[PDB]
Amino acid sequence: RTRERLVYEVRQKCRNIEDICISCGSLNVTLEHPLFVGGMCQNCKNCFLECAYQYDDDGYQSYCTICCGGREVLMCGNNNCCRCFCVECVDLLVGPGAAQAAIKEDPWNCYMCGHKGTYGLLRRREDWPSRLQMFFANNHDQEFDPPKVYPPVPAEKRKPIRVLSLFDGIATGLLVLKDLGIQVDRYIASEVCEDSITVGMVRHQGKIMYVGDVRSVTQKHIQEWGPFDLVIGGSPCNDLSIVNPARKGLYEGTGRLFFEFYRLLHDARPKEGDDRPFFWLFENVVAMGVSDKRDISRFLESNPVMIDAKEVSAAHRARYFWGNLPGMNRPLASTVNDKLELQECLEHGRIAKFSKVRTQHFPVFMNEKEDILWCTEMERVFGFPVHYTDVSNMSRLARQRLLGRSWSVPVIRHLFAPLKEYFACV
């Protein structure tokens, strides 16, 4: 208990807050903390730089901003910020009961977004943006998707797109494609879960050509299926994300599947001499261990963008996106016809207990009683058409299972947006 006693002797004014590290309590101050008044050591600088991206949970960044630790945390309601501050740090540094003073705020803004810069013994630096700007100079230059571009094509002639979908699931890709209003010559997709398959065979009238495992597909299977212009895929996470105790890593269990993509991408991407425009997209969770993400980025030789449905969908969850698509790191464009608030999704006579969802216990109030989110609603929350996923006899839990692991339709619209210029349209 070095930290508790050291902060306690900081409060008694027997020691200056500027000579200790406000993160771990070390006296080895190597730098001034960018966000707040106080020192910071080299271990906490590296901790900040690595764990700022290591710790991003789906929908939030999960932090703690201060010690890069923490269990129970207070979550910011500002959608341009999304910082969090643990309860232990607030009770320790600010003062006793200050955490319970912070809570009871339903739209809670953190100490960075707040009007005041001074909370208890905690004091925000007036020059924190540029301090973060210099602090973050030893890192994140190895990431954030340095995209490279293809030359545009004249209208006449411009052919219909040919698309290969690995791990298709619910036909999100063909849907966003048809909605984008571009002709699709061939949509060959590889999916296992029979429910997902049936959804596809119905909601697109059989346009999809279905193949088995990504493992069933041979290098010859690729070129024999004609040349492909676009290869998309979201490999199942499971053993990738850290919220799973049993995670077998990228290399075992369900992680392996990444490489299958990696394989079929390679057996797809055109060789030298081909100036043919060629696009590919690999999506995964942001909850990935840093090791596995490092490896994945190495194998794809590209870096991912962290796109959050928050900006244009009604739910906040963020995913990594690898690829070469135009406007990869482009800022999210929120439409007029997109539903930003949860309330816009619910059926008649139900109200929103929150702004945006997570799945935050029971998001809907009905007849002065808490309730679980509905399917016909959840669809809207993910931007799918209403009753899109109502097909066969499939059980409710199975349906929700399907939407739970799907892509956010408006996000994929944002990705596939600048693609209409390279292919045929209606």
């Binding site: 493992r215 290098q219 890593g249 290399y251 075992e252 392996r256 490489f259 990696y262 394989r263 390679h266 060789k271 030298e272 001499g273 490092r294 490896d295 190495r298 194998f299 030789e301």
Partner: protein, 197 residues
């Protein structure tokens, strides 16, 4: 591939992954001496190896990768060796418009799972040739080889029982020395393209 006349055979440029066959390739007269400065680029942990690193290491002709010895520690899961090998090997291939003799070999010492072997044989596009060490009519050891080197399927045996193979894996556990003598002879038909000494 087409054979290379004697008055044109160069020194062979090799890339030895996770294991080092500098020893065997020198004993086969593929490697001369003095550093070597340099013909065999060996690297044991290529978790941080970019395409540019490989390209910059001079062009390569032979790319060799092996799993750890039978029951040798842990390090990383078996499949890592395979996958990594595959990635770097794509980094090592010559441009389609500039063909040239080019060979590669990945070899396992009974360290891969049944599913891992399936992955190997699917990602390298051939089934493994299994080269046993027998003695007194008994499966002493075994390696399995994936390779494009011209004489490979020329060994592979038969009688080694996949079951008996996976049994021989069980029998030898804690000791572990890499059984290189089994893989040594495979490289022989490579002397048709590179100088001898």
């Amino acid at each position: 591939f087409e054979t290379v006349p004697v008055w044109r055979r160069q020194p062979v440029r090799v890339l030895s992954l996770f294991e080092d066959i500098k020893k065997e390739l020198t004993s086969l007269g593929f490697l001369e001496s003095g550093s070597d400065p340099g013909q065999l680029k060996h690297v044991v942990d290529v978790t941080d190896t970019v395409r540019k690193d490989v390209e910059e290491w001079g062009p390569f002709d032979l790319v060799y990768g092996a799993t750890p010895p039978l029951g040798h520690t842990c390090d990383r899961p078996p499949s890592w060796y395979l996958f990594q090998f595959h990635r770097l090997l794509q980094y090592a291939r010559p441009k389609p418009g500039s063909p040239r003799p080019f060979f590669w070999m990945f070899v396992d010492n009974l360290v891969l799972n049944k599913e891992d072997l399936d992955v190997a044989s699917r990602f390298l596009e051939m089934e493994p040739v299994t080269i046993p060490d027998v003695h007194g009519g008994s499966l002493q050891n075994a390696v399995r080889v994936w390779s494009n080197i011209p004489a490979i399927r020329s060994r592979h045996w038969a009688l080694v029982s996949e079951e008996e193979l996976s049994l021989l894996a069980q029998n030898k556990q804690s000791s572990a020395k890499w059984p290189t003598k089994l893989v040594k002879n495979c490289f022989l038909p490579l002397r048709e393209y590179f100088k001898y000494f």
